[PDB]
Amino acid sequence: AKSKNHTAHNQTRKAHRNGIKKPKTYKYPSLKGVDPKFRRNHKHALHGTAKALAAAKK
Amino acid sequence: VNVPKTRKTYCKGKTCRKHTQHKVTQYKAGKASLFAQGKRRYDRKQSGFGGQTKPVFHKKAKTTKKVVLRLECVKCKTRAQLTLKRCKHFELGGEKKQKGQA
Amino acid sequence: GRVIRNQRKGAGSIFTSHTRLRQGAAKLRTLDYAERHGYIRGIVKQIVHDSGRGAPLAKVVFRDPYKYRLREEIFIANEGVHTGQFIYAGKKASLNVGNVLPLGSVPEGTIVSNVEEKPGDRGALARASGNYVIIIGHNPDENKTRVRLPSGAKKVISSDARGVIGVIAGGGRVDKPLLKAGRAFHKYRLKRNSWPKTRGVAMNPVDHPHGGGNHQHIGKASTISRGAVSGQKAGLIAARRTGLLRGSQKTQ
RNA sequence: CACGGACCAAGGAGUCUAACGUCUAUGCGAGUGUUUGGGUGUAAAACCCAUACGCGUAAUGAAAGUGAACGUAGGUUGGGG
RNA sequence: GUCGAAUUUGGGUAUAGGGGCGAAAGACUAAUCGAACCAUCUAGUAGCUGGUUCCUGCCGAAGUUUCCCUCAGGAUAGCAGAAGCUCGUAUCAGUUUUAUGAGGUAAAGCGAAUGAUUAGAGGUUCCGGGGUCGAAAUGACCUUGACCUAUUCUCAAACUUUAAAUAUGUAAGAAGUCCUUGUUACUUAAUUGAACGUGGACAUUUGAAUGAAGAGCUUUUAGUGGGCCAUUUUUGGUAAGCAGAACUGGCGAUGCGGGAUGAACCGAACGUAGAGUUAAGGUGCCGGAAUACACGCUCAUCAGACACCACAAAAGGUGUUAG
RNA sequence: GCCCUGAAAAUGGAUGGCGCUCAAGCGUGUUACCUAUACUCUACCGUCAGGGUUGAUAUGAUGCCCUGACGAGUAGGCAGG
RNA sequence: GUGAUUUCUGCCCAGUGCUCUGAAUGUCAAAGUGAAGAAAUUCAACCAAGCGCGGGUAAACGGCGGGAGUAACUAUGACU
RNA sequence: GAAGACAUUGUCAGGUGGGGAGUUUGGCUGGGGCGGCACAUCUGUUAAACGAUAACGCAGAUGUCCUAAGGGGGGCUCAUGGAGAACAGAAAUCUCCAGUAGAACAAAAGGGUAAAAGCCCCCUUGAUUUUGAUUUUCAGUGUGAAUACAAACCAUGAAAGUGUGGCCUAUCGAUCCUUUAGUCCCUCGGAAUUUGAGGCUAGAGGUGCCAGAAAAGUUACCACAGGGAUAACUGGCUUGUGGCAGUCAAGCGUUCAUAGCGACAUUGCUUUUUGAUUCUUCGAUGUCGGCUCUUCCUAUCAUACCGAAGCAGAAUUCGGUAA
RNA sequence: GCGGAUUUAGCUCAGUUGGGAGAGCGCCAGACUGAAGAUCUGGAGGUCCUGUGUUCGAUCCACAGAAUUCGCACCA
RNA sequence: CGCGGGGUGGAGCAGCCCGGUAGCUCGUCGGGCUCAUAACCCGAAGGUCGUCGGUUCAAAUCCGGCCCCCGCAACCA
RNA sequence: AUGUUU
Ligand SMILES: [K+]
Ligand SMILES: [K+]
Ligand SMILES: [K+]
Ligand SMILES: [K+]
Ligand SMILES: [K+]
Ligand SMILES: [K+]
Ligand SMILES: [K+]
Ligand SMILES: [K+]
Ligand SMILES: [Mg+2]
Ligand SMILES: [Mg+2]
Ligand SMILES: [Mg+2]
Ligand SMILES: [Mg+2]
Ligand SMILES: [Mg+2]
Ligand SMILES: [Mg+2]
Ligand SMILES: [Mg+2]
Ligand SMILES: [Mg+2]
Ligand SMILES: [Mg+2]
Ligand SMILES: [Mg+2]
Ligand SMILES: [Mg+2]
Ligand SMILES: [Mg+2]
Ligand SMILES: [Mg+2]
Ligand SMILES: [Mg+2]
Ligand SMILES: [Mg+2]
Ligand SMILES: [Mg+2]
Ligand SMILES: [Mg+2]
Ligand SMILES: [Mg+2]
Ligand SMILES: [Mg+2]
Ligand SMILES: [Mg+2]
Ligand SMILES: [Mg+2]
Ligand SMILES: [Mg+2]
Ligand SMILES: [Mg+2]
Ligand SMILES: [Mg+2]
Ligand SMILES: [Mg+2]
Ligand SMILES: [Mg+2]
Ligand SMILES: [Mg+2]
Ligand SMILES: [Mg+2]
Ligand SMILES: [Mg+2]
Ligand SMILES: [Mg+2]
Ligand SMILES: [Mg+2]
Ligand SMILES: [Mg+2]
Ligand SMILES: [Mg+2]
Ligand SMILES: [Mg+2]
Ligand SMILES: [Mg+2]
Ligand SMILES: [Mg+2]
Ligand SMILES: [Mg+2]
Ligand SMILES: [Mg+2]
Ligand SMILES: [Mg+2]
Ligand SMILES: [Mg+2]
Ligand SMILES: [Mg+2]
Ligand SMILES: [Mg+2]
Ligand SMILES: [Mg+2]
Ligand SMILES: [Mg+2]
Ligand SMILES: [Mg+2]
Ligand SMILES: [Mg+2]
Ligand SMILES: [Mg+2]
Ligand SMILES: [Mg+2]
Ligand SMILES: [Mg+2]
Ligand SMILES: [Mg+2]
Ligand SMILES: [Mg+2]
Ligand SMILES: [Mg+2]
Ligand SMILES: [Mg+2]
Ligand SMILES: [Zn+2]
């Protein structure tokens, strides 16, 4: 016995019952796919900046 | 397909770690050995009564096997394995294509 | 998936022989000193019908050499044997119809019946009506007698084995058509429950290998291997050949 | 014009157990669980208890093995109070 | 039918279940036979059928995604409840506006490419040439074409220069803008740049509109995983109360007023009452409400009388009315 | 445009029926009127939310009181009885 | 298996069966044998029946063709 | 008497063994079966200009092929047409001109490409190593495919650069087991060495029903749980087909369209054909035909009364009221 | 209607890898015979079933058909 | 996967079983005999030994891969 | 050894 194959009927209503939520943007986003050379140098730059700011708090 | 030998390619032999000459051969599986734990277990399970105790594959669909090249560095003897796409005819010998011939 | 009739026959429940009216086992005398060394004379008192047997039986009375009494023996009557006839049995008995002789003591070409396969077995071969064994020669060293059996087979028997001179009485019996299911019924009523026979092809598959199908047919070769198992040996078991026999028999 | 049901009374169907997830309540808290057992008893109750054991306080690796502070146990941003 | 022998029959006896027995029907084997009966395993398993017991209150679905030896089932995500937690100067939005993108459908086009397609015209005789001569050559013509040129009629879901409407991405600030200069092993010819920073300045509109029973977050679980209908877009089919898709609204799960009647239509969604006003629909009587008002049309010997909806066409008529 | 011909199916029957002919038919326009669990106001019940009130005789602070809004429901969840 | 009597029972052993052959004959288990190894073990040779090889058998199971040209009207083909 | 270390008997091993035992003998599907693969996939369209989107929709394609048809660099420009040269014409080789690609790029289709991605030549192995991130399918799992980096070693070019297979969109495969390569690393748990075995990392031997059981039939002797989720009857929708009826009017009818007919077309009606569908019925609507009997319809064969004729009479034909 | 096959000089047929349309039986002509038949030589014979496209061309690489046939067409 | 056997003129076989070397029959063609045909007689043409590589003072032969055919035996992704 | 018709 054949049946229905596909429909998007009621799917938008289901999605909008709990709403379509924007993905909660954060400051300082993740560096997941950032160029690893840039990331490697960024780690040393931030380390040097932290050490400079610590030494300069007199 | 037609694959040449001597394969100037990367070697990881911890002495070369660089592009060296590699002799190319076709990988062969090798005889299934008794005393391998799976074979021992299978023989123990097949002993006695009960008949065939594990599946025997029948629904073959592939018409080709994936060619594997055993690549042996000519200086350090380290072997690497390279898998080619499926092919029905594989030759290691030469007789390269000649252009403009009749 | 059912036990077939030829498998059921081996249990011997309804397939045993109907032996009530039988006169007793037909045997030669026990091979004793008198027959081994000389001869013993008995007297044919009765020639009687045996139920289930074509050949008539002869009741022969001998004297017991060791005790004062008579010993009645049931021989298979040979043609020409009559009541009041003296039967002589032993190594030294004469070559006369009805006499029991060792096979070695008879000349080549002698016709014997109720022939022992082994000395002292009291008769195994050529016992049916009209059947007989032909002496074709002797091997005096390692004493053996070559005989031709009713089937035509050549057999080598010990020269001490005994036989009755002549042919078994009642010959020509199978020449008369039975003409009637009733006559076959009365024939087998006093032998065994082997009649009538339902064709296996007229049965269902559960009952017989030949059963089933939308037409009555065997379906596979009726020639069955000698190495087949019980329930499979229906049809022509271990047939060397099939079809109408043409030409001469006695392959060699 | 699908199925069960003529009627009535009584009976009649998510239970208990072992091991568990979340949540909640309670006791104690880097500890926790007396009740296998022992002592005791007004005797299957109640009361008391040693050594263990379980779980937690350390993870990771197949394993051999190794094993958690540069810092006011870090910096930046938001953060109730 | 048969009735004197393969006859009928009593009693005794033998053959016992995958066994017996069968002149063979899968027949008979104690009303049980294509595997007897009895007890136990056993409360066997069942994605399948039936049932599943008090009240009220609040919230409240799905027939959809993916996977499965899956298609009457399950897992998974989604829809839903409950428990809440962190805050609440507040956060965001099935919406608009402004600014800036993307699309190749509707339309349109074919004297624009591709593919079709109608006709005539002019050049190609060196047009492919034929007829006919030419004593013969295309040489003179008649001319069938096959091209080229400029036109011409009509087309495309798998054609297109162009190209909407609707729908759709992003942005409209303090996580911003501007100024100075610290880190780096990155990068640059180079303190050059990149990123992250220290310090300093800018709150009435902190940089469109409207709204905001607030926002954000977490856990865990039920049922569901046969759908169907209506407008619109649309595929197959002659078509279907057919079969399959898109968006939305509904029915399922929903009573109420209307459509006489009806799951889906119209109107409107529901605690218990009173009063008033209405919706859709109606106001001759059934039947609550004007046999109201006004302009016309129609006479039917099958008149006609409210969408969904319960049918009617081509062609005709000095019927009648108006152009 | 209206009407008529085209226009044939089987139980007797359907603008819903009766019936209706300057209609109670058709097209159009204007008012008046009728009535839903819809809208407005009020009362009561419950739910939710925001609050006030341990200053006592106040024994019901999960109590008393004020304010606003809301109430459809299968499968199903929870709560109070 | 067929199924009184009468009259017959034609061709096919390629296929599937059945059967007869057997150290000339390929494959072939365990045991046994040899070699290597320190041994587990590995390899090799040998290797029964069976199968294969060769024969028989259809009153065994069974089977038992197609095309087109051709005869003093057409037609059909004895014929090829 | 025979027979004799052979039979026999016991164990293991090979053969045979539907006689018997156990089990299996896909899914989708306008019922099922047969057919097909819409089962894992790719191109264009359906698809309604974001994305997504179904049917056993449409036109097709995939399980390959390639050491170059991969990579780099250089030089050149293709299809076609025109004009020219002995054999040589209409196709050979040579020359020029025009030539936006009308060619070619392995294959299906779509896109892309002109000092190239095409053709030729030169050199090569980036079709290499390590482990991550990301896009599509999506649960934001797997697999396949692909993208951009990093850390190496290379190739090519003068160099900038480019290359982690095929210009892009398809060309494929889990657990367990086996096997190979690497690390020469861990373990064999009373302590060692050597074999052997087990581990770690990366491949291969495959499941095409392609998220991946190991699987032949028959039942007309049949059984069970169910299913109107689903066929065989009526009924309902539709009317392709069947049947019946119109409109036009080229012609037939000697002349003459319409007495009677009537082509090429076209509009309908009916549910007495057969289809299409699967809405009702599978805890059951008794499934052909005939017999009997009642009633209904009219698309009327006869009878009543008529109109028309290619109606002189007779007979007949067409039509009306008429069941 | 589905799953298949084949289509070539008058007949039977072989082509076929992007060869090249060919062989027997026919027919014709010449041999031989007194003359036939039988033979033995040589030749012609298709625009490859039709129409349209892709290749440098094409039975042969290559699309829509046409003809001839074989198997299936079942459960009520 | 394993063990074996076979491939030779157009067709069927020998030569292979250790290198001295391509042969037998049928078939084709030419001639001869016969009045003619067959048989017969004399000639000629026809493979270089399934494909490559290997070892040989000079291999079809001996060896190793590979293509096709057959028999037996074997089968955990 | 065979060689068909008139
Ligand atoms: K076992
Ligand atoms: K049978
Ligand atoms: K045979
Ligand atoms: K045979
Ligand atoms: K068996
Ligand atoms: K079965
Ligand atoms: K019709
Ligand atoms: K039914
Ligand atoms: Mg579904
Ligand atoms: Mg064991
Ligand atoms: Mg065993
Ligand atoms: Mg008999
Ligand atoms: Mg019989
Ligand atoms: Mg029967
Ligand atoms: Mg049987
Ligand atoms: Mg059998
Ligand atoms: Mg029968
Ligand atoms: Mg009904
Ligand atoms: Mg039911
Ligand atoms: Mg009932
Ligand atoms: Mg009760
Ligand atoms: Mg039967
Ligand atoms: Mg139960
Ligand atoms: Mg609600
Ligand atoms: Mg599976
Ligand atoms: Mg159900
Ligand atoms: Mg499009
Ligand atoms: Mg358009
Ligand atoms: Mg369901
Ligand atoms: Mg349906
Ligand atoms: Mg429901
Ligand atoms: Mg409603
Ligand atoms: Mg109505
Ligand atoms: Mg009134
Ligand atoms: Mg009209
Ligand atoms: Mg009318
Ligand atoms: Mg009214
Ligand atoms: Mg009016
Ligand atoms: Mg009210
Ligand atoms: Mg409160
Ligand atoms: Mg409620
Ligand atoms: Mg007969
Ligand atoms: Mg016969
Ligand atoms: Mg052995
Ligand atoms: Mg043997
Ligand atoms: Mg069985
Ligand atoms: Mg199915
Ligand atoms: Mg789109
Ligand atoms: Mg270039
Ligand atoms: Mg894929
Ligand atoms: Mg690179
Ligand atoms: Mg794999
Ligand atoms: Mg392993
Ligand atoms: Mg140990
Ligand atoms: Mg799958
Ligand atoms: Mg139904
Ligand atoms: Mg019709
Ligand atoms: Mg009934
Ligand atoms: Mg009835
Ligand atoms: Mg009428
Ligand atoms: Mg004559
Ligand atoms: Zn190396």
From Swiss-Prot, chain A:
- The entry's keywords: Cytoplasm, Isopeptide bond, Ribonucleoprotein, Ribosomal protein, Ubl conjugation
Q: Which GO terms describe its cellular component?
A: cytoplasm; cytosol; cytosolic large ribosomal subunit
Give an example GO biological process.
cytoplasmic translation
Q: Where in the cell is it found?
A: Cytoplasm
**According to its UniProt record, what is one Pfam family this protein matches?**
Ribosomal_L29e
Q: GO molecular function terms here? A: structural constituent of ribosome
The cross-link Glycyl lysine isopeptide (Lys-Gly) (interchain with G-Cter in ubiquitin) sits at K51
The cross-references to InterPro entries, in alphabetical order and at most eight, read: Ribosomal_eL29
Q: Where is this region: Disordered?
A: 1-36
Q: Does Amino-acid biosynthesis show up as a keyword for this record?
A: no
Q: Which domain of life is it from?
A: Eukaryota
From start to end residue, where is composition biased (Basic residues)? 1-25
Q: Does the keyword Iron apply?
A: no
Gene3D superfamilies found in the cross-reference section: 6.10.140.1730
Query: What PANTHER family would the database entry show?
Result: 60S RIBOSOMAL PROTEIN L29
Something else known? Present with 51100 molecules/cell in log phase SD medium.
**Quaternary organization:** Component of the large ribosomal subunit (LSU). Mature yeast ribosomes consist of a small (40S) and a large (60S) subunit. The 40S small subunit contains 1 molecule of ribosomal RNA (18S rRNA) and 33 different proteins (encoded by 57 genes). The large 60S subunit contains 3 rRNA molecules (25S, 5.8S and 5S rRNA) and 46 different proteins (encoded by 81 genes).
| Role this protein plays | Component of the ribosome, a large ribonucleoprotein complex responsible for the synthesis of proteins in the cell. The small ribosomal subunit (SSU) binds messenger RNAs (mRNAs) and translates the encoded message by selecting cognate aminoacyl-transfer RNA (tRNA) molecules. The large subunit (LSU) contains the ribosomal catalytic site termed the peptidyl transferase center (PTC), which catalyzes the formation of peptide bonds, thereby polymerizing the amino acids delivered by tRNAs into a polypeptide chain.
In the record, the note on similarity to other proteins reads: Belongs to the eukaryotic ribosomal protein eL29 family.
Q: What is this protein called?
A: Large ribosomal subunit protein eL29
UniProtKB/Swiss-Prot annotation, chain B:
Q: Which GO terms describe its molecular function?
A: structural constituent of ribosome
The listed outcome for P55Q is: Confers resistance to cycloheximide, an inhibitor of polypeptide elongation
Q: Name one GO biological process term.
A: response to antibiotic
Q: Which InterPro entries match?
A: Ribosomal_eL44, Ribosomal_LSU_eL42, Ribosomal_zn-bd
- One Pfam family, short name please? Ribosomal_L44
Q: How is it modified after translation?
A: In wild-type cells, 78% of L42 is monomethylated at both Lys-39 and Lys-54, and 22% are a mixture of species with either residue monomethylated.
Q: Where in the cell is it found?
A: Cytoplasm
* Described function: Component of the ribosome, a large ribonucleoprotein complex responsible for the synthesis of proteins in the cell. The small ribosomal subunit (SSU) binds messenger RNAs (mRNAs) and translates the encoded message by selecting cognate aminoacyl-transfer RNA (tRNA) molecules. The large subunit (LSU) contains the ribosomal catalytic site termed the peptidyl transferase center (PTC), which catalyzes the formation of peptide bonds, thereby polymerizing the amino acids delivered by tRNAs into a polypeptide chain.
Q: Which family does it belong to?
A: Belongs to the eukaryotic ribosomal protein eL42 family.
Subunit note: Component of the large ribosomal subunit (LSU). Mature yeast ribosomes consist of a small (40S) and a large (60S) subunit. The 40S small subunit contains 1 molecule of ribosomal RNA (18S rRNA) and 33 different proteins (encoded by 57 genes). The large 60S subunit contains 3 rRNA molecules (25S, 5.8S and 5S rRNA) and 46 different proteins (encoded by 81 genes).
- Protein name, entry field: Large ribosomal subunit protein eL42A
Q: Which organism is this entry from?
A: Saccharomyces cerevisiae (strain ATCC 204508 / S288c)
Gene behind this chain? Answer: RPL42A
UniProtKB/Swiss-Prot annotation, chain C:
Task: Set out the biological process GO terms recorded for this chain's protein.
Answer: cytoplasmic translation; maintenance of translational fidelity; ribosomal large subunit biogenesis
Entries under InterPro entries matching the protein = NA-bd_OB-fold (IPR012340), Rib_uL2_dom2 (IPR014722), Ribosomal_uL2 (IPR002171), Ribosomal_uL2_C (IPR022669), Ribosomal_uL2_CS (IPR022671), Ribosomal_uL2_dom3 (IPR014726), Ribosomal_uL2_RNA-bd_dom (IPR022666), Translation_prot_SH3-like_sf (IPR008991)
Is Ribonucleoprotein included in the keywords of this UniProt record?
A: yes
Q: Which domain of life is it from?
A: Eukaryota
Entry keyword set: Cytoplasm, Isopeptide bond, Phosphoprotein, Ribonucleoprotein, Ribosomal protein, RNA-binding, rRNA-binding, Ubl conjugation
**Compartmental location:** Cytoplasm
Coarse class of the primary localization is: cytoplasm
Which protein family is it in? Belongs to the universal ribosomal protein uL2 family.
The entry's other comment says: There are 2 genes for uL2 in yeast.
Record function comment: Component of the ribosome, a large ribonucleoprotein complex responsible for the synthesis of proteins in the cell. The small ribosomal subunit (SSU) binds messenger RNAs (mRNAs) and translates the encoded message by selecting cognate aminoacyl-transfer RNA (tRNA) molecules. The large subunit (LSU) contains the ribosomal catalytic site termed the peptidyl transferase center (PTC), which catalyzes the formation of peptide bonds, thereby polymerizing the amino acids delivered by tRNAs into a polypeptide chain.
Q: How does it assemble?
A: Component of the large ribosomal subunit (LSU). Mature yeast ribosomes consist of a small (40S) and a large (60S) subunit. The 40S small subunit contains 1 molecule of ribosomal RNA (18S rRNA) and 33 different proteins (encoded by 57 genes). The large 60S subunit contains 3 rRNA molecules (25S, 5.8S and 5S rRNA) and 46 different proteins (encoded by 81 genes).
- Extract the PANTHER family matched here: LARGE RIBOSOMAL SUBUNIT PROTEIN UL2, RIBOSOMAL PROTEIN L2
Name the UniProt record assigns to this protein: Large ribosomal subunit protein uL2A
